[PDB]
Design an enzyme around this catalytic site. Structure first.
Site, PDB file in Angstrom:
ATOM      1  N   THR B 145     -11.049  38.339 -39.146  1.00 43.56           N
ATOM      2  CA  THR B 145      -9.911  37.419 -39.122  1.00 43.56           C
ATOM      3  C   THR B 145      -9.370  37.286 -37.693  1.00 43.56           C
ATOM      4  OG1 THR B 145      -9.375  37.810 -41.416  1.00 43.56           O
ATOM      5  CG2 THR B 145      -7.611  36.953 -40.024  1.00 43.56           C
ATOM      6  N   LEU B 146      -9.097  38.410 -37.005  1.00 42.12           N
ATOM      7  CA  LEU B 146      -8.613  38.345 -35.626  1.00 42.12           C
ATOM      8  C   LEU B 146      -9.620  37.673 -34.740  1.00 42.12           C
ATOM      9  CD1 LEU B 146      -6.495  40.310 -36.804  1.00 42.12           C
ATOM     10  CD2 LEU B 146      -6.466  41.448 -34.588  1.00 42.12           C
ATOM     11  N   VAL B 224      -6.250  43.865 -28.708  1.00 40.83           N
ATOM     12  CA  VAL B 224      -5.332  43.591 -29.788  1.00 40.83           C
ATOM     13  C   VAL B 224      -5.728  44.337 -31.054  1.00 40.83           C
ATOM     14  CG1 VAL B 224      -4.457  41.384 -28.915  1.00 40.83           C
ATOM     15  CG2 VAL B 224      -6.526  41.416 -30.302  1.00 40.83           C
ATOM     16  N   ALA B 225      -6.623  45.338 -30.904  1.00 43.62           N
ATOM     17  CA  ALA B 225      -7.182  46.047 -32.045  1.00 43.62           C
ATOM     18  C   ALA B 225      -6.382  47.312 -32.363  1.00 43.62           C
ATOM     19  CB  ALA B 225      -8.645  46.316 -31.764  1.00 43.62           C
ATOM     20  N   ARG B 226      -6.833  48.443 -31.791  1.00 43.26           N
ATOM     21  CA  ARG B 226      -6.101  49.698 -31.797  1.00 43.26           C
ATOM     22  C   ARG B 226      -6.308  50.341 -30.443  1.00 43.26           C
ATOM     23  NH1 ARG B 226      -3.649  48.021 -35.427  1.00 43.26           N
ATOM     24  NH2 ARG B 226      -3.362  48.825 -37.544  1.00 43.26           N
ATOM     25  N   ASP B 250      -1.946  45.016 -26.096  1.00 42.24           N
ATOM     26  CA  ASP B 250      -0.939  44.991 -27.152  1.00 42.24           C
ATOM     27  C   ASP B 250      -0.833  46.349 -27.881  1.00 42.24           C
ATOM     28  OD1 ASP B 250       1.052  43.430 -28.627  1.00 42.24           O
ATOM     29  OD2 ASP B 250      -0.347  43.543 -30.370  1.00 42.24           O
ATOM     30  N   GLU B 255       1.948  55.013 -28.711  1.00 40.18           N
ATOM     31  CA  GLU B 255       2.899  53.935 -28.807  1.00 40.18           C
ATOM     32  C   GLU B 255       4.229  54.508 -29.292  1.00 40.18           C
ATOM     33  OE1 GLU B 255       1.335  50.843 -31.412  1.00 40.18           O
ATOM     34  OE2 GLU B 255      -0.498  50.734 -30.144  1.00 40.18           O
ATOM     35  N   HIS B 274       2.893  45.870 -29.193  1.00 43.06           N
ATOM     36  CA  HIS B 274       2.293  45.812 -30.525  1.00 43.06           C
ATOM     37  C   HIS B 274       2.950  44.709 -31.376  1.00 43.06           C
ATOM     38  CE1 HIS B 274      -0.248  48.268 -33.631  1.00 43.06           C
ATOM     39  NE2 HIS B 274      -0.169  47.014 -34.015  1.00 43.06           N
ATOM     40  N   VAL B 275       2.874  43.500 -30.829  1.00 44.73           N
ATOM     41  CA  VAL B 275       3.532  42.323 -31.341  1.00 44.73           C
ATOM     42  C   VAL B 275       2.617  41.104 -31.256  1.00 44.73           C
ATOM     43  CG1 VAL B 275       5.959  42.986 -30.980  1.00 44.73           C
ATOM     44  CG2 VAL B 275       4.634  41.999 -29.087  1.00 44.73           C
ATOM     45  N   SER B 276       1.306  41.270 -31.074  1.00 44.14           N
ATOM     46  CA  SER B 276       0.437  40.111 -30.978  1.00 44.14           C
ATOM     47  C   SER B 276       0.369  39.363 -32.306  1.00 44.14           C
ATOM     48  CB  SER B 276      -0.944  40.423 -30.481  1.00 44.14           C
ATOM     49  OG  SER B 276      -1.652  41.285 -31.351  1.00 44.14           O
ATOM     50  N   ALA B 277       0.666  40.033 -33.416  1.00 41.69           N
ATOM     51  CA  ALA B 277       0.705  39.424 -34.750  1.00 41.69           C
ATOM     52  C   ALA B 277       2.138  39.171 -35.244  1.00 41.69           C
ATOM     53  CB  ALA B 277       0.003  40.323 -35.725  1.00 41.69           C
TER      54      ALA B 277
HETATM   55  N1  NAP Z   1      -2.324  44.209 -32.744  1.00 38.65           N
HETATM   56  C1  NAP Z   1      -1.970  43.886 -33.993  1.00 38.65           C
HETATM   57  O1  NAP Z   1      -0.794  43.681 -34.343  1.00 38.65           O
HETATM   58  C2  NAP Z   1      -3.015  43.780 -35.043  1.00 38.65           C
HETATM   59  C3  NAP Z   1      -2.904  42.937 -36.131  1.00 38.65           C
HETATM   60  C4  NAP Z   1      -3.873  42.887 -37.109  1.00 38.65           C
HETATM   61  C5  NAP Z   1      -5.003  43.681 -36.985  1.00 38.65           C
HETATM   62  N2  NAP Z   1      -5.119  44.532 -35.923  1.00 38.65           N
HETATM   63  C6  NAP Z   1      -6.305  45.403 -35.813  1.00 38.65           C
HETATM   64  O2  NAP Z   1      -7.436  44.582 -35.865  1.00 38.65           O
HETATM   65  C7  NAP Z   1      -8.397  45.101 -36.807  1.00 38.65           C
HETATM   66  C8  NAP Z   1      -9.307  44.014 -37.294  1.00 38.65           C
HETATM   67  O3  NAP Z   1      -8.525  43.191 -38.228  1.00 38.65           O
HETATM   68  P1  NAP Z   1      -9.227  41.961 -38.957  1.00 38.65           P
HETATM   69  O4  NAP Z   1      -8.253  41.459 -39.978  1.00 38.65           O
HETATM   70  O5  NAP Z   1      -9.866  41.029 -37.991  1.00 38.65           O
HETATM   71  O6  NAP Z   1     -10.434  42.764 -39.711  1.00 38.65           O
HETATM   72  P2  NAP Z   1     -11.763  42.191 -40.379  1.00 38.65           P
HETATM   73  O7  NAP Z   1     -11.532  40.771 -40.811  1.00 38.65           O
HETATM   74  O8  NAP Z   1     -12.184  43.180 -41.413  1.00 38.65           O
HETATM   75  O9  NAP Z   1     -12.822  42.132 -39.211  1.00 38.65           O
HETATM   76  C9  NAP Z   1     -13.335  43.287 -38.548  1.00 38.65           C
HETATM   77  C10 NAP Z   1     -14.512  42.862 -37.701  1.00 38.65           C
HETATM   78  O10 NAP Z   1     -14.929  44.003 -36.906  1.00 38.65           O
HETATM   79  C11 NAP Z   1     -16.331  44.049 -36.946  1.00 38.65           C
HETATM   80  N3  NAP Z   1     -16.783  45.377 -36.550  1.00 38.65           N
HETATM   81  C12 NAP Z   1     -16.658  46.574 -37.214  1.00 38.65           C
HETATM   82  N4  NAP Z   1     -17.158  47.591 -36.536  1.00 38.65           N
HETATM   83  C13 NAP Z   1     -17.558  47.044 -35.324  1.00 38.65           C
HETATM   84  C14 NAP Z   1     -18.205  47.572 -34.194  1.00 38.65           C
HETATM   85  N5  NAP Z   1     -18.509  48.862 -34.046  1.00 38.65           N
HETATM   86  N6  NAP Z   1     -18.472  46.743 -33.156  1.00 38.65           N
HETATM   87  C15 NAP Z   1     -18.173  45.442 -33.289  1.00 38.65           C
HETATM   88  N7  NAP Z   1     -17.615  44.824 -34.338  1.00 38.65           N
HETATM   89  C16 NAP Z   1     -17.361  45.674 -35.343  1.00 38.65           C
HETATM   90  C17 NAP Z   1     -16.677  43.619 -38.360  1.00 38.65           C
HETATM   91  O11 NAP Z   1     -18.065  43.246 -38.330  1.00 38.65           O
HETATM   92  P3  NAP Z   1     -18.807  42.554 -39.579  1.00 38.65           P
HETATM   93  O12 NAP Z   1     -18.173  41.215 -39.828  1.00 38.65           O
HETATM   94  O13 NAP Z   1     -20.252  42.420 -39.169  1.00 38.65           O
HETATM   95  O14 NAP Z   1     -18.633  43.531 -40.745  1.00 38.65           O
HETATM   96  C18 NAP Z   1     -15.759  42.388 -38.469  1.00 38.65           C
HETATM   97  O15 NAP Z   1     -16.364  41.260 -37.850  1.00 38.65           O
HETATM   98  C19 NAP Z   1      -7.534  45.814 -37.838  1.00 38.65           C
HETATM   99  O16 NAP Z   1      -8.270  46.859 -38.464  1.00 38.65           O
HETATM  100  C20 NAP Z   1      -6.397  46.386 -36.980  1.00 38.65           C
HETATM  101  O17 NAP Z   1      -6.749  47.658 -36.472  1.00 38.65           O
HETATM  102  C21 NAP Z   1      -4.152  44.575 -34.960  1.00 38.65           C
HETATM  103  K     K Z   2     -10.699  39.553 -43.039  1.00 37.80           K
END
Ligand code: NAP
Ligand code: K
Ligand code: NAP
Ligand code: CL
Ligand code: CL
Ligand code: CL
Ligand code: K
Ligand code: K
Ligand code: K
Ligand code: K
Ligand code: K
Ligand code: K
Ligand code: K
Ligand code: K
Ligand code: K
Ligand code: K
Ligand code: K
Ligand code: MG
Ligand code: MG
Ligand code: MG
Ligand code: MG
Ligand code: MG
Ligand code: MG
Lengths: 308, 308
Positions: B145-146, B224-226, B250, B255, B274-277
């Site tokens: 999604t991100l 913007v991940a962790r 972010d 933190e 930690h506000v990108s979302a």
């Molecule tokens: N900063 C913020 O406020 C904020 C907000 C929301 C989320 N986040 C962080 O962002 C993360 C992702 O959220 P999302 O909703 O985008 O999750 P998501 O839709 O489940 O997508 C995760 C993506 O990461 C890929 N992936 C997993 N392991 C990987 C690796 N080793 N190398 C490369 N790609 C890999 C997955 O690959 P596949 O598609 O091939 O399975 C998928 O494409 C969350 O878990 C959270 O930690 C941060």
């Molecule tokens: K998703």
């Protein structure tokens, strides 16, 4: 009309190093030479310049390296038989990106975070402060190269886009276009109002106290056109009273913006120093127009971007 | 499963006022109630929460209001017979916009201009500093999604987009997808490297000194991940040595980012807390997930975003 030399006026330095531009014009088929500020011109000369000099009226052709030619006395060029062209058409990407950057800055609160960064402060926004451009309304006043660069990027980001242009005629990615006598209808419901018109007798002072009254209290003004399109003292008063919420301003009625302007001091004003169109490749972008027009003049075709 | 109540844990306040979310669900079909941090739960209870409490294991269903569930003890949920869902799917526009904002800020130099604004200084950039995103390469690591929210906006801005995901499978708007064993190939030629993966066994410490060596010296990291996907001390070292040019961050190892971190002081680092979302409509966006899973519970269908 027979061009034998392209002179590059020193004023081009206000946008790009002169030597970079001169080197980009190698292989033009005429020599390209630097011209200092008190040089003389004559038949066969073309001049590329940022500003106007009366000495240019002895040349055959002046290419203004800006889109905006408001500082050139167009009437005197015709009398002297000197062609005048401008550089409209090359600033859509630069200015479109800068304006997208201004709007995303406000929506995502990047500027507030940068302020906090200076203080090492982890300051969390109030819940109502962060928003998305997606779903928000922008009104773009002026729907040419700059305005369309803004519109296309705004539309791609999911904004509702309306705008204003002289003809009022449709534009791709603008849902509703208004003529200038319906400006107040166009701006009234917008979260952002972007100014992208030339400075003319008609547009000078377009945006003044009545327009700030009409605008939403939560709206921001973006000026990437020319400072005097806005009545600057009215903008200050509107910001002071909260008639509008803020502004992103690249251009001002006096530039450089004096150190003592009130505009520096507002949290939700972004000041940028007339650089919304800045680019490390401006020399290539302008050179392309020069090459085009040299060919046109050489073959007796109509010049591109001919002002007079 | 058969839900009779949704409790809204007060920790949802780390993203949204609990009362805003409670009121948004007034027509859900089950009552929605504020829960303080020491309440107990039972059969028929669902709970919405930011973080885990052991008291929730007496409920039937916990909806985590975050995409990232790395601070939940997933193991223990199965044993207690408590369903756990997350909020992946709802942060694409907010994070996509923020990241487009970061990238445009670097390209168009808006952060430098903000710094100069505080000093009332009209400071013109070096010729080589401003550029366009159009034509530049971004590598997006994580294509969910991100990552797709970043990709789609980058692509619409004219960027060349490559990326990394677990499966290796094609993704709309990504020219070349790599598997995680080819990270170094994916990042090597990118102007921007964006991290958008969950924190897992495999992703922790993914981006460290060797990755900064591989990256271009003119490139910027976006996280913007962790925070722990990056080895933070190695990022500092890389910025100090000029191994990369800068970063938009972010999320951090610790933190709030400690005040003595060197990260605050780099000109070409953007810190955001930690506000990108963050969004003034987060209540609505999370509520939509609750409503969807209430329908699934009522009809006996599989829950959306079920973790365990
Ligand atoms: N900063 C913020 O406020 C904020 C907000 C929301 C989320 N986040 C962080 O962002 C993360 C992702 O959220 P999302 O909703 O985008 O999750 P998501 O839709 O489940 O997508 C995760 C993506 O990461 C890929 N992936 C997993 N392991 C990987 C690796 N080793 N190398 C490369 N790609 C890999 C997955 O690959 P596949 O598609 O091939 O399975 C998928 O494409 C969350 O878990 C959270 O930690 C941060
Ligand atoms: K998703
Ligand atoms: N900040 C910077 O660095 C920077 C850079 C480049 C340009 N500029 C400024 O931007 C101006 C516009 O440049 P451009 O290349 O986009 O010009 P352009 O392509 O000629 O477009 C001008 C647009 O303004 C419209 N217009 C004229 N009078 C108007 C009025 N009274 N109200 C509303 N719209 C009106 C025109 O209407 P029609 O479509 O009906 O003709 C057209 O849509 C320049 O003249 C310059 O002053 C600033
Ligand atoms: Cl004025
Ligand atoms: Cl509230
Ligand atoms: Cl670390
Ligand atoms: K002449
Ligand atoms: K034009
Ligand atoms: K249209
Ligand atoms: K108003
Ligand atoms: K109003
Ligand atoms: K309601
Ligand atoms: K249970
Ligand atoms: K593809
Ligand atoms: K590693
Ligand atoms: K490197
Ligand atoms: K390298
Ligand atoms: Mg504040
Ligand atoms: Mg008026
Ligand atoms: Mg000040
Ligand atoms: Mg021809
Ligand atoms: Mg490694
Ligand atoms: Mg500091």
């Amino acid at each position: 009309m027979h061009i034998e030399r392209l002179a590059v006026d020193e004023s081009v330095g206000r946008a790009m190093p002169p030597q970079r531009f001169i080197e980009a014009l190698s292989d033009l088929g005429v020599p390209v030479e630097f011209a200092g500020e008190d040089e003389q011109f004559g038949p066969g000369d073309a001049v590329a310049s940022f500003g106007h000099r009366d000495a240019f009226l002895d040349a055959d052709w002046v290419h203004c390296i800006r889109a905006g030619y408001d500082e050139f006395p167009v009437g005197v060029y015709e009398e002297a038989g000197t062609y005048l062209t401008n550089s409209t058409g090359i600033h859509g990407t630069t200015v479109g990106e800068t304006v997208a950057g201004y709007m995303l800055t406000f929506a995502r609160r990047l500027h507030a975070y940068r302020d906090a960064q200076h203080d090492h402060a982890w300051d969390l926004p109030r819940y109502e402060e962060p928003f998305t451009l997606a779903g928000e309304r922008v009104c773009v006043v002026g729907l040419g190269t700059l305005g369309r660069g803004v519109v296309d990027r705004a539309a791609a980001l999911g904004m509702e886009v309306v705008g204003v242009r002289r003809s009022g005629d449709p534009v791709d990615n603008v849902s509703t276009v208004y003529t200038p006598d319906r400006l107040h209808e166009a701006i009234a419901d917008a979260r952002f109002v972007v100014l992208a018109t030339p400075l003319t007798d008609e547009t000078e002072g377009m945006v003044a106290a009545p327009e700030f009254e009409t605008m939403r209290e939560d709206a921001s003004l973006v000026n990437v056109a020319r400072g005097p399109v806005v009545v600057e003292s009215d903008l200050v008063a509107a910001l002071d009273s909260g008639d509008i919420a803020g502004a992103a301003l690249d251009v001002f009625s006096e530039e450089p913006l004096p150190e003592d302007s009130p505009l520096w001091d507002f949290e939700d004003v972004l000041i940028t120093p007339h650089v919304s169109a800045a680019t490390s490749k401006y020399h290539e972008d302008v050179a392309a127009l020069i090459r085009e027009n040299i060919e046109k003049i050489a073959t007796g075709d109509e010049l591109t971007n001919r002002v007079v």
